[PDB]
Amino acid sequence: KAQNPMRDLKIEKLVLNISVGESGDRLTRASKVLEQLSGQTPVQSKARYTVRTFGIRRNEKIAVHVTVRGPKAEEILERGLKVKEYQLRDRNFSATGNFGFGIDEHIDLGIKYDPSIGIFGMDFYVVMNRPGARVTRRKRCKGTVGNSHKTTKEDTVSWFKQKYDADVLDK
Amino acid sequence: NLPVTVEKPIPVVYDLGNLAAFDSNVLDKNDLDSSNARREEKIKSLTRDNVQLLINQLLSLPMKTTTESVGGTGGQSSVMTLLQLPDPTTDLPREKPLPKAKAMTKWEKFAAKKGIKPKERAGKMIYDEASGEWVPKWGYKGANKKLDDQWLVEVDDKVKGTDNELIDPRTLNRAERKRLVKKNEKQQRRNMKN
Amino acid sequence: STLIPPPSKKQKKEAQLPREVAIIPKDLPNVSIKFQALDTGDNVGGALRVPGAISEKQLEELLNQLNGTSDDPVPYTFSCTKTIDITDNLYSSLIKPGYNSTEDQITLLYTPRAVFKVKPVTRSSSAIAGHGSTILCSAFAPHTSSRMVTGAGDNTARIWDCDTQTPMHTLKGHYNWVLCVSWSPDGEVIATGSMDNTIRLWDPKSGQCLGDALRGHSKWITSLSWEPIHLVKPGSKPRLASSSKDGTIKIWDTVSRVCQYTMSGHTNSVSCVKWGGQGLLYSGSHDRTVRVWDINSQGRCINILKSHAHWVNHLSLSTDYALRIGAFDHTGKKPSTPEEAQKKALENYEKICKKNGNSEEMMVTASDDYTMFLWNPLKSTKPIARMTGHQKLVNHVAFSPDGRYIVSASFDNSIKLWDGRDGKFISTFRGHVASVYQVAWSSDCRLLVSCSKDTTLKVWDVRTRKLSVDLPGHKDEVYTVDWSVDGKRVCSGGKDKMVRLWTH
Amino acid sequence: AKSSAYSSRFQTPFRRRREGKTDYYQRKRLVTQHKAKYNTPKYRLVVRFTNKDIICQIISSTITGDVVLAAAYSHELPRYGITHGLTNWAAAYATGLLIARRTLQKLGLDEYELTEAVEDGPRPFKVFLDIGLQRTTTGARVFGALKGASDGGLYVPHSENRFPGWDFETEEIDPELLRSYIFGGHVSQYMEELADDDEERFSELFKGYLADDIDADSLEDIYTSAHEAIRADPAFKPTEKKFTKEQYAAESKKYRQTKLSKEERAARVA
Amino acid sequence: NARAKRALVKREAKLVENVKQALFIPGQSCNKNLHDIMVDLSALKKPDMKRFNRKNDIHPFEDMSPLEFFSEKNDCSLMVLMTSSKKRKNNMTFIRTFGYKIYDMIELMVADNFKLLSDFKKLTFTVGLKPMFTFQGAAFDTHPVYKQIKSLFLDFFRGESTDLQDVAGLQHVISMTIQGDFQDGEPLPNVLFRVYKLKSYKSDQGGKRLPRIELVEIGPRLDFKIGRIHTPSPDMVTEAHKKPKQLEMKTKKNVELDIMGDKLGRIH
Amino acid sequence: ILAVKKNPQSPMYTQLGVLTKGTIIEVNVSELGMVTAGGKVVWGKYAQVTNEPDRDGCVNAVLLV
RNA sequence: GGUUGCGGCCAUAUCUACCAGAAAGCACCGUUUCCCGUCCGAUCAACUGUAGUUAAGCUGGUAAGAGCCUGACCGAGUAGUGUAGUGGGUGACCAUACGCGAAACUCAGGUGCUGCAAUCU
RNA sequence: GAGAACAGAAAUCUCCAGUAGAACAAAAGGGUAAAAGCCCCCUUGAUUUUGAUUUUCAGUGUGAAUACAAACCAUGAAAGU
């Protein structure tokens, strides 16, 4: 069951997110640096609500995000872990097996700083699932996933321990 | 080679528009009772004879042929031959009553009295003199709302000495247009009430 | 759209009234009939009594039994002479109108027919692009309906695979418009005569050019005709006769790629040349004359036929379909050896040529004097008949594959159907609203297709003498239409630079 | 934390919608809607793709469940000479051609109905294309099967803006690229490109072609021979069955779990 | 909004009415037999059928307002209420409405000796084509109750009315026969409802234009006992059988329209 | 000529049938042999008058194609 | 008997949790030159059935689970609800004959049937 | 409900459950979930034009309004709408 090659946990997708709130030159530079870091054009996200405290109107631009898959996503993930000095908390993981973390200064990832670029923080989020994750996503005969094949927090912690040899910090 | 000439005591009447036949002959209750074992064969044979007569009538009906091909409107192409069904004869009640003609409105009575003929209504496009373009006279990008977007409007002298002096003439014209629209709606609801 | 007048109230009442069923009475007596062959006029069996409950199939089998050829019966169609055909049975065809009764004798003329049946084309199989200019000519392969050759105004021809309706080969040797194309009756080579006063030969399977062009004409090629296979001795390839605007008919031996004979009698442009089945060449030219040359007499002009007052635009022979098809049939079966091909082509020619005693090959000439002339050039120098009635020039003319009907397509927006023996007028196909450019028979002689200046094709049923189906789809004038040998496909081309394939 | 009220008030969809393989919104317009009220029966050419087979079926809707009139599969293509790539564009074309020729042969159009008493000649067979839950894309194998059936001789109403070779800037098609896709020129082009670029991937892919010594230039020839053979003999041959119905039933019932009686279940409870 | 207006226009009255819709309502007491018969008749009626799934406390001869509400909500002019009781076993009530008001009602009971559509296991016809009809027994022509039965079933299964009919669609016939003739002062005989598929064979006596017909039963065979009747008023009958007459050209004396479409007048 | 569709001067002149320059008229085009893409024969189309018939004694028009 | 494609009836078919499935089929699964689409070949599109796998998907078994369904000569012809012979009583109301006519309750049980085509050690 | 720097109850991203408990109109006692909701592509024609047909007007009775139909038109691979 665990010895079967079809239950292995892999990187489904990696989402790089920047939620800058105010739209303009800073949002454009965030989209530019995400394009630099991923090699792909990012996508904006429309405003969902309107709050005077946050100063955001309806249908405004707040954030940008990119999804990366494959060896490029693995390279970006290992750059993020290299910046994170290989120390992950147990609260970064969640019940569904995916995990995220925030980087406050993106210069250490491998991008030379420029005075126009400034300082940007970004959110890494890694989604974990086994092969056969398209059963819930294909057009024809859409179906659920059984519990045994489902992804659990303890199993993805075990996979991370096997892969990166990093202690899961309780506190 | 079975015969196709059904012989009946009482001649069957036909409603070819409804694809129906009616024979008013005598049926034996002992031959049609549920006790018998040949009752289904009797029913099948009676229906067989009536359907034979009906199909003979339908195939004796006049036929419509065409020379048009497929891919056009109509449905019938050159290879198809269609029976021309007559109007149905059986009287059937309608689901809803006939649409009553709406009574003449106040405008219609006035126009009849004054002999005003209805408008030709060729189109909604009018020629704007200041430009060289044809524009809609109402509706989407219509020419009835150009004063709303006019860059400069002269304030009329008659507005002086009134509390409407400081109000935008564009806003005043929008209010007057909306009042005219609501007056038309109220007149229509009055005609519906009457 | 202008509509037919709707039925009135009284007509609707009569329609609601019950109908009468046409049924054969069980007490129908016997009727005496005489079978007479339409082609030969030979009476068979004298007069014989038959019951009134006969069918067309049973009458056909009875006639075969009377002849004594029951092992291999040959289908027939029966008519009574007005001349009214037997549709289903004798009672409902003749006795029901009451013109011929059970007491009087009924003389039924029977005509042989084709065992195969061609379904009418009713829709466009495909619209295929590829030509850079207007399509000027088109033809089908004699052996198969899957290959079509089309010559256009972009100085090229195309070979189209009609199975997938996709282009297969491009023939790019000429420098000017490809005015005519022709597939060899053995199916081995395509000849293209062009506007640049040249003729080229192409291998179709490889889509290649057989060496160099056939040069020698000073004006553009007007028509290409092939030597018949049934006259070509086995082990040899048929020669190519070619007419041109310069008034000459050149004969080309293609194995040696030489020009042998140069007929020169015409004083104006030759409209068409035809290679008949008795070693003769018939040429129609704008000098208002028809010249008959003998290939067995060194190409000398045996006859000059002068009855037209204007250009003879076209000419057709009674055996034209057989000479075009060679040794093939509607089945598409290929002969084993060239000797077998020669014998089979001989039989195919003979079936049409030698009937009712002596072999004859009638000719029809359509001219610019709004008329046609029907000739029998071997027997007499005078025309057999003059066919008049068209208001404008007769552009195209064609004998039926069995040679019993003549169809003329004219510029008066009409087609006229005439009898193929005496040239007497039969009927007028109307429905085109512009000039009819050309026409084509089907293999079983039952259906006709015509292309017009009005951007439409029209398929007509010869038996009912009425329009069968009207096919639009071309965006411009249609210049050429052809029907396959097996009667499965129809190709059309014109000014819209597209090839339309049509099928049932 | 679903409650009894939720489970009682739940309104389940149809079975074919739960295990989604039937689009009822499309199907009701396919079956119950008519352009004219002349009562002409409708037929569907259903085209479906598995991971290893292509299914084409001519189906007439019936009130007690629809009935298949004629069927063809891509696993019958090795019989006609196509043993590799049974789920590509050319395989779809071959399956469409096969089902078209087989239907025409069965109906007698080319080599006692009530229409024979009114008309002299038979109508061309009209079927409407049914694609199910498949994306309509320019160059899809379902439209390849459509092209194959149309060339075979069935009348399927269609426009050509989804065939390969259709230019997007102008409403025109490229029959050269269409013929390349018909005779597998794209697969042969990939075969040559891999053979010249990376022998490693051409070792994995197209291994059977190397095993059978089938060159990258004979694909058109074998497709042409398959088309000729299909047109020559389209009649369906059922596969000769090694074992019988009862034998299959017994052998499968040996593996399927038997039923346990209510008394046995109560004994297990107590 | 535009879709709502289009739905209202489709619902509103017109000179040429659309096909009557049939709504199948199960009652308080229902059975598998009632469900099977309702499914078979809904197959015979569709695509002009709508079916309700829950149970409804409906008594047609005690309160018409739920039926009127259902008819007005679903825009259905034909209604079939399927209920059961000891007094009336397998009761099917056929309601026909005029202008969302109860025009007439018949109340029949299905006999226990019914064969379903699934029992025959025979090939059937294509979905949604109008059938042929045969009515056997002079009571359909003469007696008021059987007059109502004939008109009701013709209206129920008529479907679309057209002036052109494809011969390839002459598939099946519905036969209604009266179980033996009767006299005055006698109980009403049952009505037998049958469905047959046509098979045409060459006759060899009437030529190739007149074939021979044979029938194969598809079901469901039904024996209806005529329990209860509710008749419409004469004014409602006249209002329902009025004609629009806007469609027909007015017929003027001595004026005709000939084959070429010219208006001609006659003088005497 | 079949009808006077639109006189540009006035609808009154349209309904009187005035034929002046610029007037849209309907003309029978049966002899032009026009056929629709659907196969129907066109025998009525629109033309615009391009001359002054009161000045030159004749009506000249250009078809609107 | 399994499985697939197209269906009818639309929970006896649904939800939750374990186990089983030989063959065939189905599916996960490999690649991105081609036609095609996204931020992402994840979905869609194309190619090989070639590297593998029944881990899921799919089906079946199991559960005094939730839910659903069906027969009752079970409630019950009861409650309820309308007319009546001059039936009473100046009284607030009631059995009676004829009509129409339930649900709550109890018992017996159940957890998918089927139409067309093709195929499987 | 689980997680993800600023970012907490309310800003942005991911997973799972989610019969609609949202958003459109009506006042359902059964409206709509591979939608009738949200987003995208195409159409800007929508006051077309023909009619011996229905109704009304006219000193300009083969004109115009009006009803109905048809030919078109839009879109889609198509069924169709």
Numbering used by the authors:
A (entry chain J): 4 to 174
B (entry chain w): 8 to 201
C (entry chain x): 2 to 82, 93 to 515
D (entry chain D): 7 to 117, 129 to 287
E (entry chain v): 9 to 276
F (entry chain r): 197 to 261
What do the study authors state?
Biogenesis of the large ribosomal (60S) subunit involves the assembly of three rRNAs and 46 proteins, a process requiring approximately 70 ribosome biogenesis factors (RBFs) that bind and release the pre-60S at specific steps along the assembly pathway. The methyltransferase Spb1 and the K-loop GTPase Nog2 are essential RBFs that engage the rRNA A-loop during sequential steps in 60S maturation. Spb1 methylates the A-loop nucleotide G2922 and a catalytically deficient mutant strain (spb1D52A) has a severe 60S biogenesis defect. Nog2 is an essential hub enzyme that acts as a key quality control element during the nucleoplasmic maturation of 60S, anchoring both the pre- and post-rotation states of the 5S rRNP (Nog2pre and Nog2post) via extensive rRNA and RBF interactions.
Because the disordered A-loop remains in the vicinity of the active site after premature GTP hydrolysis, we hypothesized that addition of AlF4− could recapitulate a GTP hydrolysis transition state in these particles. A 2.4 Å cryo-EM reconstruction of this sample shows additional planar density consistent with AlF4− in the active site of Nog2 as well as the reappearance of density for G2922 and the rest of the A-loop near the Nog2 active site. As expected, the 2´-OH of G2922 is now unmethylated and helps co-ordinates a triad of water molecules linking G2922 and AlF4− The water closest to the AlF4− moiety is at a distance of ~2.0 Å, consistent with the predicted position of the attacking nucleophilic water. This catalytic water is coordinated by the backbone carboxyl group of residue T350 as well as a bridging water that forms a hydrogen bond with the C2 amino group of the G2922 base and the backbone carbonyl of G369 within sensor II. The third water is H-bonded to the 2´OH of the G2922 ribose, assuming a position similar to that occupied by the methyl group of mG2922 in the WT SPB1 structure. The Nog2 transition state shows a remarkable structural similarity to the high-resolution crystal structure of the bacterial K-loop GTPase MnmE22, with near identical positioning of GDP, AlF4− and the catalytic water network. We believe this represents the first evidence of direct activation of a GTPase by an RNA nucleotide.
